[PDB]
Amino acid sequence: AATGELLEKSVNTIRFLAIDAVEKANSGHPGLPMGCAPMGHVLYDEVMRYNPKNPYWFNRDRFVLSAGHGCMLQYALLHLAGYDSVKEEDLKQFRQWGSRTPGHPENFETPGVEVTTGPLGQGIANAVGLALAEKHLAARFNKPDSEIVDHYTYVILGDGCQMEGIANEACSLAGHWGLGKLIAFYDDNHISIDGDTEIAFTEDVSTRFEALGWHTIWVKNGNTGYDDIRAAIKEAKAVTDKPTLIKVTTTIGFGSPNKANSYSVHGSALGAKEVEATRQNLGWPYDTFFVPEDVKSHWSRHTPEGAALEADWNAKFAEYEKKYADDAATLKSIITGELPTGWVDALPKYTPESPGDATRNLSQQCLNALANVVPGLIGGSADLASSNMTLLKMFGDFQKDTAEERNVRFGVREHGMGAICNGIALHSPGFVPYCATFFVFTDYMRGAMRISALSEAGVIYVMTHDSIGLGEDGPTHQPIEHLVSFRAMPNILMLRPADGNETAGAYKVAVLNRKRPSILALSRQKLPHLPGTSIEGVEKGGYTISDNSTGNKPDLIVMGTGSELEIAAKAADELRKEGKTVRVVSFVSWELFDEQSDEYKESVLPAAVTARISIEAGSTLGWQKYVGAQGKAIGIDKFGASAPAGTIYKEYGITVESIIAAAKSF
Amino acid sequence: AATGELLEKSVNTIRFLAIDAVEKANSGHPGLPMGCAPMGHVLYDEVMRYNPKNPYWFNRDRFVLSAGHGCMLQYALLHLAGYDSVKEEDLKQFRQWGSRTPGHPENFETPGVEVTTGPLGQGIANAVGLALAEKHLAARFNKPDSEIVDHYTYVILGDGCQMEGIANEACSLAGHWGLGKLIAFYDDNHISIDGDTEIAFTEDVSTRFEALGWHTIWVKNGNTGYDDIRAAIKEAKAVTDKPTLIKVTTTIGFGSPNKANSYSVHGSALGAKEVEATRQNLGWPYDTFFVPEDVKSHWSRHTPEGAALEADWNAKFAEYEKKYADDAATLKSIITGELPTGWVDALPKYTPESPGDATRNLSQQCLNALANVVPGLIGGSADLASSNMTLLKMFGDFQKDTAEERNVRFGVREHGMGAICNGIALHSPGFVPYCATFFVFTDYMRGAMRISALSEAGVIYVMTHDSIGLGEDGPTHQPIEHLVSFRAMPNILMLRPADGNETAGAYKVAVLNRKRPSILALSRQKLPHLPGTSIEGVEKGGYTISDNSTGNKPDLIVMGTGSELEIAAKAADELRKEGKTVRVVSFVSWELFDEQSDEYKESVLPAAVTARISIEAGSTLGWQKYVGAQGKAIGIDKFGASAPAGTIYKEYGITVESIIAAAKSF
Ligand SMILES: Cc1ncc(C[n+]2csc(CCOP(=O)(O)OP(=O)(O)O)c2C)c(N)n1
Ligand SMILES: Cc1ncc(C[n+]2csc(CCOP(=O)(O)OP(=O)(O)O)c2C)c(N)n1
Ligand SMILES: [Mg+2]
Ligand SMILES: [Mg+2]
C-alpha cells in the first residue's frame, strides 16, 4: 500500500485527472471525485480483486458508482488501474461524441463499468442485485473443497441516492437477505444541488439503515482518515450476515479553496482561476492529465498482480470442472451465456383443441419449463406470486439461509425489483432474470426499465393484468397508455401474446435476447388457443394467422394483439360467411414486425389493401402506421372502469360488432 | 362514544357491510376492513371533525385510505356517517359499472373520498401534501387571537405502502417539515398477498420512522384495544412538532374462523359457508347490508353535530374576515377556487425586440409573475431549483418554522413530490401546486402523474432539459419516448412551448386547468421568439404561426414543437424563397388540438394537402396522425449520446437540411 507523500500524490492524481477532464470538456462534476479520491484510491489500489486486462473475469469484485455524475472518479481509477477502455486520450475525450468516457457511466461503452448509472438510486439497487447474484452462485455451486464463487460488491452512493425511494426499497431487501458481501460507501458531504442537505434532508440515515438490517460504520474524516477507511472495510468483511453502510464524511470539492463545501463545485468546471488556486492549495505543480512517475510505477503492479489473481481462480475452476463436471457445466452456462443445446424444445406446445387459459397461467408453464434448461433463469414477483403466476414449482425461495433457491420474493418494491434484476443480468451474461407486477405498475419501476433498455440488460418483464380485462379493480389498475409508452421506448420488446403458442414464442424471443429487455403483457382472463398462432410467427412480430384471400388482395385486414386477437378472429369468421375475403394478423410485437424485410411486410400488409382494422384494449396511438390513411383503430383513449370485465368490453366497444361496423364504413 | 354491546355492534356493522358488499360483488377485499373496523370506528365516530352533509367544508379533518384495496372500510364509514354519496343502494353496487363504490377509492366518483388510492404508497404521500397544505395555510393566515386554520390529516396504510419507495420519500419530508398534525395508522397485520411478511419484509418499520423524524406509538391489540387506540390518537394529537406513526397490530379478516390471519382473506369474497361461519363466530344475526337501529341512532348524531361544527367555524371565519379583511379575502380565494380578476394580465408578453431565451428561464418569469396574482401557487423542484428555474424570488422556503413560505424544496424525491402535490391540489380548489425535475425523470414519478390525470388534480409539472438539447449529460438524461408516453395518457396536457409567448400560453392553460394536470416540456438551451406564436394559439394546441399559401392549399405544411419549431420556421423561409407556399404549424399541445372543431382542424391541416413534415427531438411514434402515410416525421427513435448538443442535432439529422430533403421527396 502507498504511504506518506506517494499516497498523497496518488490521491491528488485522481483529484486532478477529474478536475482537468471536466475543465477540458467545460462540462461535468468535479466535486464528488475531489471528495471521494481517498476512498476511491483505497478501493481500487488496496481492496478490490480484479484483472484490469480482463474486465469480464467471473470472480472479480464488482464496483458501482451509484452517484454516476461523479464518473470521473471511476474513469481516473480505471485509467490508473490499467483498463484498456480508459487510455489518457479517453480522459481527454470526456463527454465528447462517441467517447468511452460519457458524462455518466455506461457499461455498454466502457468495459470495466459494470452497470449504467446517472439516474440516482439505480446503482445502489444494482449493487443489491450483483450481491444477490454472488450469494446465489456461491450457495448453489461452492463445495466443501472448492470456494469457486467468492467476490464482494462495493458501491459509492451520495445524498441523492439516499433520498430516492428505489434505494430504500433495495436496501430493505439487502438487509432482509443478509447480503454480507455488499459494502456501500455513503459520501456524507452535506451537499446536493440545492446546497446544504439541511434544506430538505435531515433524517438519521445511519439509524434508518440499522432499521433495514444493515451493519453501520461512521468514518468521520473521509478526506484524510485512510486508516479509518481501511479499518471500516476490514470490519465490514468481518460482519458476514448483514450488508454494511460505511458513512464516509467528506468535503465535496476537497482542495478547492473557493468552491469546497458548496453546491458551486457539484456540477461545473472549476474554471481557469480556481483550477490554478486548487493546484497551488494542494501543491500540484504538474501539467494537465499528468500521472507522476512514482504514482505510475506504484499502480503498474495491478497488471501483473491482476493476471496472477485471475490465473489462481482459473486453476480453482479447472479443479472444480475435474471433480464436479455436471455442476461446472451448469455454472459455465451462467458464466459464458451459452444456453444449453435444445433448450427451446422444453417450451410447451398447444393446438386449438387445448383448453382455453389466461396467458398469465401459460406464462407460468413457460417459466417452469425454462427453469429446467436455462440455468441462469432466476426471479419473481413484487408480492403477486399467486396473481402474476411466477413461482418455479421445483424451487424454494431465495433467502439469507437458502440463497441457492431461484424464486426471488421482492415484496411491494417494483422499482427496486427492476434495478436488482438489472444487477443480476449484468453480473454474468448467462443470467436470465425475470420480474413481475401488474402491467399498470410498470409506471413505478419505469426508471429501471428504461435503464434495462439503455444498458442492454436482458431482463424479462412478466406483466399480467394487462387491460380492462382485469375488471373490478377499476381504472387505478387498468393499463391504457402502457403498451404504446413502451413501443416508443428504444431497445425494448413490447410482446402481447394471444394464447399458448404466442406465449411460448414470446418466451423463446425473451430468452434469446440477452442484450434487449422483453416485456410480456399477459391476461388475467382465460383466452382460447387460436388456429394459426406459432413461435415462428411471434419471431416476426406481425404475421397472418388466417386468410381466405387470393392474389395477396384480401377485401379486409383485421389486426389484433393479446386478448383482442380472438375478437378479430371471430369478426373475420362472420365477415367471411357474408362472402368477404379477410386476413387476420397478429401484432404480438410491433418492434419485431418493423425489423422484417419490405417483401415480408408486403406479404402481410399489401400496399393495395386499404381496408384495415386494428383492435387492442389500450391507446389507439401509433396504430395508424399499420391501418393506414383509410383504416380504423378500435381501442381505448380514456381511463377504465370498476366493473366485471365483460361489461367494460361491451361499454368500451371492444367487440366483434365494432369490427363489423368499421368494415361496413369503408 | 359507544360503550359495551353498542360499541361491539357498531364495529361489527362496519365488518359485515364490508363482508356483504364484497360477497354480493363476488370481488374485493374483506380482510383489511375486518381488521381495521376498530380504528375506523374510533376515527369516524369519535375523533374526526367533519360535516357529513358538506364534504367540502374547508376546516374538516382529512382521512386517506392509502391501502385503497380496503375501500369497503371507508364506504361503510361514509355510509354510517350520513354522506349523501354512499347510500345502501351504493353499497349494493360495489365494484359495479359506474357506481359511487368503485373497487379502489376515487375522489372523482365519491364525494367524501379526498384523493384516489389503490396504487400502494400514493395515499401516505398524499396525506403528507394535505398536512403541508394545512400547515402552510395555518402559518400564512393564523393570528395570535384567530386559529382559523386548524385540522388534522389521518391516514391508514398497510405493509404494501410501507415497502413502497414513494412512502419512505414522503415520510422523510414529513419528518423534516415537522408535520405534527399528520397522524398515520400502520395496519400491522403481518400479511400481504405473498402471505406472512417474513417472506420479504423484516425491517424495523417503527425505528425507520424514528430515524425519519417521526413520533411513534404501538397499539399491540388493535382488534379489541379500543381504549389503547383512543389513547394513542390523543397522544399523537398532543405531539405538535413531529408527525406520528401509530403502529396498530390487527388480525386481517378478524372474526373469520377459517380465513383470519392468512393471504386467503386479503383479496377475495369469504364465500357462502365462511360468511355464515363469520356471522356465527361474531354473533351477527342481521340480514345483509343491515345497520341495527341502535347503531343507526348512535351514528345519526353526526348530521346535527357536523352541521354545528361547520357553523361554529363559519362564525370564526366571519370574525377573521371582520378583523383581518385582506388576509380573509386571500384565504377565501384558496378555499373557493375563485382566481383573482385579471390574473392572466400578469403573464409576460414578447415581441421581435425581446432577446431569445431558454423556455426554462421563460418558465421562471411566468411562475414569478403568477405568484403575485395566484394566491394558491406553491411548489418547487426535486433538488434542481437553479437548473429547472423554479424559485419564486419574492418568497423564502417552506420549512417547519417558516411554513408560510411558498417555495417547496423536495430534495431528490420525484415520486414523493408528485403525490405530495396531488395532496396539495385536492386539499382546496384554489391551490395551484407546481413541481419540477428534468423531464427524463418523469419516469421515477409516473405513478403519481398518472393519478394526477385520473383524480383530476391540476398539478403543474415543470419539466426542463426536455431533449438531446441538454448535450453532455448523455442518454441517461435525454428524453426520447417521454412526449408520446404522455400524449397517450388520458387527461393530461403535454405542452411543449417554443418561446416566450408559447410559455405564457402554456401557463395560462395550466392555471385554468384545475381538473387536468399539465406537463410543460422546457428547454435547457436558448431559443428565439418566433413571429406568430400567441397565447390564443396555445389554447388551440395546434395552430398556424406563418403561411404564404392561398385557398387553404399550401404546397407544404411543416409542423414542430418546442426547440424544433425554429428549425421548421427556418426551413419554411428557405422553401418560400424558391416560390413554394409553406404553412408552419405549432403543435404545442396535441390534446388541445384534438379537442377543436372539424372546421378548425381542416383550417390548419387541410385534407387535400398530403405534403406534410413534422420535426421534434423525440420519438416519431404517433406523428402519422398529423403528417399522414405520405408525410414524413423527423425525430429520434433511438437513445441519445454524451456530446455537445449541437453535435447531437447534426448527427441525428434534426436539421433544416432534413426538412428540405423530405420536401424534395414528395
Ligand atoms: C433520479 C434523478 N433525479 C435527479 C437527478 C439530477 N441530479 C444529479 S446529481 C443530483 C444530486 C446531487 O447530490 P448528491 O447525490 O449528494 O451528489 P454530490 O453533489 O454530493 O456529489 C441531482 C438532483 C438525477 N441524476 N437522477
Ligand atoms: C404499487 C402497487 N403495486 C402492487 C399492487 C397490488 N397489491 C394490491 S394490495 C397489495 C399488498 C397488500 O398488502 P398490504 O398492503 O399489507 O394489505 P393487507 O393484505 O394487509 O390488507 C398488493 C401487492 C398495488 N395495488 N399497488
Ligand atoms: Mg452530496
Ligand atoms: Mg398487511
Author numbering:
A (entry chain BBB), B (entry chain AAA): 10 to 675
What do the authors report?
First isolated in 1991 from the fungus identified as Paecilomyces variotii SANK 21086, cornexistin (6) was shown to display excellent post‐emergence efficacy against a range of weed species, whilst also exhibiting selectivity for corn. Because of its unique chemical structure and its promising weed control profile, cornexistin (6) has been the topic of several research programs over the years. Guided by an X‐Ray co‐crystal structure of cornexistin bound to transketolase from Zea mays, we attempted to identify the key interactions that are necessary for cornexistin to maintain its herbicidal profile.
To better understand the molecular basis of cornexistin binding to its target enzyme, we determined the X‐ray crystal structure of cornexistin in complex with TK from Zea mays at a resolution of 1.9 Å. The X‐ray co‐crystal structure reveals that cornexistin binds to residues from both TK monomers in its diacid form 7 (presumably arising from hydrolysis of the maleic anhydride) thus effectively blocking the entrance to the TK active site. The two carboxyl groups of diacid 7 interact with the sidechains from Arg369, Ser396, His474 and Arg533 of the first monomer. In addition, hydrogen bonds are observed from the C2‐hydroxyl group to the sidechain of Asp482 from the same monomer and from the C8‐hydroxyl group to mainchain atoms from Gly37 and Gly276 of the second monomer. It should be noted that the shortest distance between the atoms from diacid 7 and the TPP cofactor in the crystal structure is 6.6 Å, effectively showing that they are not interacting with each other when engaging TK. The importance of the C2‐hydroxyl group close to the alkyl moiety was then explored. This hydroxyl group bridges directly to the sidechain of Asp482B and via an internal water molecule to the side chain of His38A. We confirmed Zea mays TK inhibition in the double‐digit μM‐range (IC50=50±5 μM). In contrast, the C2‐hydroxyl group is prominently involved in a hydrogen bonding network to Asp482 from the first monomer and two adjacent water molecules that in turn are near the reactive ylide of the TPP cofactor.
